[PDB]
Amino acid sequence: GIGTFVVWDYVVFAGMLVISAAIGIYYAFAMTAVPVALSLTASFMSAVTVLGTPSEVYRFGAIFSIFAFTYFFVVVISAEVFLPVFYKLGITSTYEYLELRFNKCVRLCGTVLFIVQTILYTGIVIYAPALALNQVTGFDLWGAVVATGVVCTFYCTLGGLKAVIWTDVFQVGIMVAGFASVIIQAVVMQGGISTILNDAYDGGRLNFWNFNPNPLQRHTFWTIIIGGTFTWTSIYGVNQSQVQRYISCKSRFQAKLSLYINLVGLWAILTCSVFCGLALYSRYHDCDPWTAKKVSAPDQLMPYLVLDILQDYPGLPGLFVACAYSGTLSTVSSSINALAAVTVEDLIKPYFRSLSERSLSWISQGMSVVYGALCIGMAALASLMGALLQAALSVFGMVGGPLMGLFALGILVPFANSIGALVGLMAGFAISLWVGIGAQIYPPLPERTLPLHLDIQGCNVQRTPLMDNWYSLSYLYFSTVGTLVTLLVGILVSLST
Amino acid sequence: QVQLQESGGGLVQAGGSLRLSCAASGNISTRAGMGWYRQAPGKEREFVASINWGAITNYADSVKGRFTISRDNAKNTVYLQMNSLKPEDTAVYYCAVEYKYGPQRSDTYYYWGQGTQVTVSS
Known part of the structure; x- marks a missing residue:
């Protein structure tokens, strides 16, 4: 048949979700580089890079495997270049550095780029597993978003703050069981790894080497190496959520090592999701779940596989919807509290600045409900924007790209004038x-x-030369064309003065 | 990306026979639905002769019966074969492979190869 949820695994999804909240509430109501490297993996292990990486390898080939070198070229740059600057100066948070190298006005011009990047990304951490829950249950796609949003805004009651190792080992601990549920049963349903890796070659899904040296192609070897490094350096080098847990490590050699331990972990989640993408093609190289037996979105290709493969195993298809949902309760609550304390630190200095602690503790939870509406409101925007991995790396590139240019202009260029x-x-x-x-x-x-x-078979003038030659730029180049403009423009104005 | 090539075409007698071959290198999907388009001088891209993975063979109304086409899935190639050559059907011929990548109707692209000119005499 087809297979769906039953009454017995529904509680498995809810029971694995509440115990992750139970670990968080106990240590709230109560760094030696091995915890923070695993906590650096849990931020990568979102519902974007679990639900959307197989559905993108299934459609655009396995050229995404070249990112395994891109993940190596970012942790080399983010440890040699960007790490000893934020550590040896005793920086508290990486946006306080911007008023040390430049004037104080660009820091308020800096964290406004961080807020528009964060609320555009955390709308994709929310909408993506709600795009999975709508597939497995048919609940509703717009109601499961506001279901997910209100449980994290009420998790801003000091539960989401003070992130613990024990609520981060459970994210990987479900995810190491979430993929091993779906990798292992897909091999025994298709008969060997050498059968999964055989119909994928006949479908052309291998596609490892492209080498076409023009920026207008979407996925080349050069786009993933050159442009993909400048996208991910904006995340592992300058983004405040992923530099705060580098300074908090005690020894400088250990904090460098924590960036080198999750390189194995990034190589694990990439390999265990590319191989789910090749498993997803060999199951459906006759009748795709698009075009027939439809799934609305492309990102409903992983939860459609799980109820198709684990239909005879009760209990286990609830585990796959759990590991998609497990990443969001740690991410979004930390995403909102990153937006909360930075805004109220930003706000007090142009304000009256002499209010009492009663209003300041009120405004810390005053704006937290406001941003959660902007979290929900941007999540309704994310029903557009397409593939939800192409859109998760664009808003890192198109916004957080030039933000990485200031730290490149500040650190490397010794004559960076603040104007x-x-x-x-x-x-x-x-x-x-x-x-x-x-x-x-x-x-x-x-x-x-x-x-x-x-x-589909075996299932028993409009263009203008600006729209074609520059709007067809690669989506991994939206930070290369951002950083290599604010480094050129940022020097020549500084060279004029 | 597929970088496909072709051969088998040139000056023949008007009324004879010919077989046009077309290979396909690269990472081309086997279950693809390769086709055969042509372009007359001064005209538009002319008919499709599509053959899918299930060998459901299609022709245009001008070329029913007189032309035939068959493929094999072992080497990813297509053979367009000619009979009853008219004095005016001469053109350049392209070897397209129609990918389908979505649920709508107007989302197909073609991977056009190089041309091959075939001429007649009388």
């Missing part, structure tokens, strides 16, 4: 938002994105 960086940032943020929205309004043609076949 040069402020007009350098807003020039770079304008070029990236020009190409970043131009691609998401007019998508690239399929001769540049190269999507693969889907095989």
